[PDB]
Symmetry: C5
Subunit: 205 residues, 5 copies
Amino acid sequence: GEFQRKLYKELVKNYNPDVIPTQRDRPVTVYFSLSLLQIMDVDEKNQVVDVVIWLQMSWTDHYLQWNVSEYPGVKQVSVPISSLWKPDILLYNAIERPEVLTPQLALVNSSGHVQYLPSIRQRFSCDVSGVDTESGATCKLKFGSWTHHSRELDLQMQEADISGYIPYSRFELVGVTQKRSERFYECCKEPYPDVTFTVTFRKKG
Amino acid sequence: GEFQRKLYKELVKNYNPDVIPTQRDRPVTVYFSLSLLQIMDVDEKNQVVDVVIWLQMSWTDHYLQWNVSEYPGVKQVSVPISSLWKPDILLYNAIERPEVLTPQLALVNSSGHVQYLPSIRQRFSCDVSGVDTESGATCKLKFGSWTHHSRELDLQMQEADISGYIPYSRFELVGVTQKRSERFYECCKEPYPDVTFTVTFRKKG
Amino acid sequence: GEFQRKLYKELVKNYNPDVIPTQRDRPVTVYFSLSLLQIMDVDEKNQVVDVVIWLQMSWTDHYLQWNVSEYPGVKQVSVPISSLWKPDILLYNAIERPEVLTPQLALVNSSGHVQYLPSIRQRFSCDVSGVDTESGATCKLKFGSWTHHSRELDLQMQEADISGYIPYSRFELVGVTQKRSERFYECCKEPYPDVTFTVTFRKKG
Amino acid sequence: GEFQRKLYKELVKNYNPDVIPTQRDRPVTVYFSLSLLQIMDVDEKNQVVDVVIWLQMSWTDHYLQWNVSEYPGVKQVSVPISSLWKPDILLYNAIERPEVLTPQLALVNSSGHVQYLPSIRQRFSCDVSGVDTESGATCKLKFGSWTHHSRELDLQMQEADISGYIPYSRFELVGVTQKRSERFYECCKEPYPDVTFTVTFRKKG
Amino acid sequence: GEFQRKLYKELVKNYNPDVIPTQRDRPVTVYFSLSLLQIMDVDEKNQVVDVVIWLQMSWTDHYLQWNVSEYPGVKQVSVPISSLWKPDILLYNAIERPEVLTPQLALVNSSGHVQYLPSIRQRFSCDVSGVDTESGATCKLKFGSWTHHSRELDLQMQEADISGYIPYSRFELVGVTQKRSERFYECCKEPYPDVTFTVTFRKKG
Ligand SMILES: *[C@@H]1O[C@H](CO)[C@@H](O[C@@H]2O[C@H](CO)[C@@H](O[C@@H]3O[C@H](CO[C@H]4O[C@H](CO)[C@@H](O)[C@H](O)[C@@H]4O)[C@@H](O)[C@H](O[C@H]4O[C@H](CO)[C@@H](O)[C@H](O)[C@@H]4O)[C@@H]3O)[C@H](O)[C@H]2NC(C)=O)[C@H](O)[C@H]1NC(C)=O
Ligand SMILES: *[C@@H]1O[C@H](CO)[C@@H](O[C@@H]2O[C@H](CO)[C@@H](O[C@@H]3O[C@H](CO)[C@@H](O)[C@H](O)[C@@H]3O)[C@H](O)[C@H]2NC(C)=O)[C@H](O)[C@H]1NC(C)=O
Ligand SMILES: *[C@@H]1O[C@H](CO)[C@@H](O[C@@H]2O[C@H](CO)[C@@H](O[C@@H]3O[C@H](CO)[C@@H](O)[C@H](O)[C@@H]3O)[C@H](O)[C@H]2NC(C)=O)[C@H](O)[C@H]1NC(C)=O
Ligand SMILES: *[C@@H]1O[C@H](CO)[C@@H](O[C@@H]2O[C@H](CO)[C@@H](O)[C@H](O)[C@H]2NC(C)=O)[C@H](O)[C@H]1NC(C)=O
Ligand SMILES: *[C@@H]1O[C@H](CO)[C@@H](O[C@@H]2O[C@H](CO)[C@@H](O)[C@H](O)[C@H]2NC(C)=O)[C@H](O)[C@H]1NC(C)=O
Ligand SMILES: O=C(Nc1ccc(Br)cn1)[C@@H]1CCCNC1
């Protein structure tokens, strides 16, 4: 791509990926969603769950926009996430770092809309004593920004599915639910939005 | 030697390896193939398979071509893959990152034809309940680009091998098959090509 | 952030993050505290404890201050800890490196006050023979600077918590305590401050 | 000291360590040899062997030569292998990456002769069903260049050792042998040299 | 603070940390010593020992000296070891890389005297068949430079400790000893100094 190469040359000018791309008094809105793909194992003694999940993040970076008439054919581009601002979201339940299974790339369109969809292997903390009963075991997965409050980063959920769930795993799903919440912590005087996914599962036999 | 060093100096000028090397409305065609070398282990409880496979990728980068009369004796060069555009292909079944066994190098000829043949240790998801029966257990390995559609990256399969398979492993092969598929998904208005390899194997005793 | 981007450009000028930001004959005061989140496992044979703990560090870097009238709306900024001076604190009991669960980011306000709150998975050495008794097993966690004495880095403790402790872990807490200590060795004429947190716990069965 | 520092400044000028240092129609000859230090474990079920081996590589880089009269006292220098051209040799039997135990440094003399002697922990594939018999189990270790043919990189073996072998390991050696081989495939018109070491060992009980 | 920042700016000028800081025909003398902190585990089948040890290295770098009258108050500085020349010492018995537990920092005074005291978790090879007897099991730990001979790097031992040994480990110490040696080998025409520490220990039950 000749035009793509000219575009990347224009896009890098003055762009600093350590700065959140806010504007006037508008936050950056980040749409967040999840697909549970597989439950791999449960550690009943240490109260741990091992999963593969597919995170889905979307936002708008007003510094990454261009005139599509000026760069013809260049509808959307594939950029390594390392060279963009990325929201600093994390799973509060985790007891190990995430292992990232997908390429570390994001899609960007001409509006400056960004899409980043990492698939991750993750172990996390949960009371799983009921996993071998009819009613099963329920676990929470709280996600949110580490350093940014509502007025800087507006976290917003989108609807999940379980169409990706694996049929041949020895755990079946009894229920899922999701909820956006906004809260105060003692630390900080502003409010912090989180998105929490709840999964009830159990052993098949 | 001397000429190769002058060549690398000319090739780096203006080359950006984060940009796919397309032109007008010609995709980059990537020829993709595979050799299964060994099945290392199977986890019957967690439904996982552990393998060593030898991936074979070939494409053409019109920015990596040179006049062989200007660089005499320089027929082909050995370049670290880190300094080229590389196709963003992945195994959709994987539940861990790949462990790469080979040097991270590619061969490039004077036309700009590129060749990259990584050998990989990889664990992936498969229903292997039938692995201890006469008919055995069948597993799929779906490969494809993470961000690029047909009009940008034309995935094309080539005929695969089991001539390298290991005789002393405790699993025998009952059959293999391979299939290219092209599909439309709700997400995107363009089509996405994948290449899928299917292996049926079973335990010897 | 337009102003944030201008600010980072001014803050990097002459900043060297390998130099401790002392001034005249004032040390850098570092306020240090902790929250115990979970006891994951105990190795009775090897005398090891596995935990998740949330460290809380605060200090002031007089090179990171700015006039808020010059950078309007810029109250506080989110910076990667890699590009600041960071205190060289460690856990003297540790027998493995720390696994850092949180994003490696710190908050900085317009005074130059810095805040860094890593959450960590850590294995460490402790006599845990009494863990299966009524009175239980007591373990110490000694923290302090590796290279800096009191006149350069003034370590100060703050009151630690167990409000985050996990209810479903198979260990219950019998008590906690904390103590700052300042000490001389024959070697060196200056004193060295440490902060030590003590936890008594036991097995629920 | 002073002269070594001046020498490194002159040696880096125009040196590109991604280019093989060939000349006219002379390959780079690489002398390759090995010492088996210890057999650590054998996995009879998965057909794997775990070893520590000491590789010994020597070659000549005509770009790394200097006049010893101009740099007096500077007979040989210790350089990090990362800043030289290194041959792209690998073990074809390996099923995991190598764990390098030694410092990543090479010795260079005033002729431009280079010496690099990494010691490595390595797991590899071998039929070890006979390991518990009188005649024992034989395993091959095939080494060679990944991208370079005979006219570019002349692989040459040298006589190997077992004088370093550990007496207290539970495996004894019944024999070793070594062989250089040169081979054609239909694909490619140039020949490819490998060096293979064969070890027969058995369990002492 | 201000003066330290000016000093680091002057010290980096012309400093190349890949070059050993020798002078005329004076080697760099490196004083080396050790404290055994804990024996963590023993593998009786594979003949391996797991330890934590505290290495103590001191030398003089005549390029890192400054006039204390010119940089008032600047008695000593804390520098990351990555930006200095460091001696290339290793443990010849090791079968895994070292896990470094301490911050990677060294102390430097105005004379150019350097101090670097890494604490390390390390597994190594030893005959430990006698570990369950009255007389116990003896193991050697040979340290020395990988690339430097006596005329460049003069290794010198200093008297070691067991005052830091852990009382609650299930191994007790029966004795320690230490010895500096200098040798010629066929390889090399110059002599090579090593420092070896011997530890006899046994199981308490
Ligand atoms: C960046 O973020 C930091 C992090 O806290 C802020 O720093 C604090 O700022 C506050 C607000 O100005 C300071 O508050 C003052 O603290 C002083 C503390 O010192 C005394 O008290 C304790 C004893 O318990 C000891 O630390 C010390 O030895 C002293 O004895 C007080 O002197 C002040 O009290 C006075 O002010 C109040 C107003 O709040 C008056 O109403 C009272 O009458 C009284 O006169 C006050 O409490 C605090 O010092 C700072 N803390 C730290 C840790 O630095 C920065 O302010 C913030 N950036 C910006 C721009 O605000
Ligand atoms: C860059 O990508 C973004 C994300 O796909 C595009 O934004 C989307 O734009 C469309 C039309 O502008 C929006 O569709 C409308 O949605 C509402 C309901 O949500 C509905 O009432 C309308 O009838 C219509 O369906 C869509 O909401 C919007 N989504 C987001 C998250 O912004 C954008 O158009 C792309 N840019 C270019 C130049 O193609
Ligand atoms: C730089 O280092 C290299 C190390 O290899 C030196 O090269 C080799 O030096 C040896 C010295 O023994 C030469 O050996 C010769 O080999 C025959 C063996 O049949 C022997 O009979 C001769 O008497 C002689 O010793 C060898 O020629 C040479 N390497 C090769 C590939 O031929 C080199 O000398 C060093 N240079 C300097 C200036 O230090
Ligand atoms: C660069 O490599 C390409 C691909 O290997 C070469 O093109 C092939 O050459 C063979 C000759 O045996 C043809 O039959 C194939 O059809 C070609 N393949 C493709 C995919 O085009 C080409 O010859 C090489 N370049 C040079 C200058 O020799
Ligand atoms: C820099 O540090 C070295 C390391 O200790 C100091 O040298 C030692 O100082 C004592 C006390 O005078 C002597 O008895 C030792 O023999 C010295 N040398 C060594 C190699 O241990 C040195 O004095 C310090 N320099 C300054 C200017 O403070
Ligand atoms: O022990 C305290 N804090 C503390 C100490 C260690 C740990 Br772990 C957790 N919390 C006291 C508790 C009562 C109030 N003052 C601090």
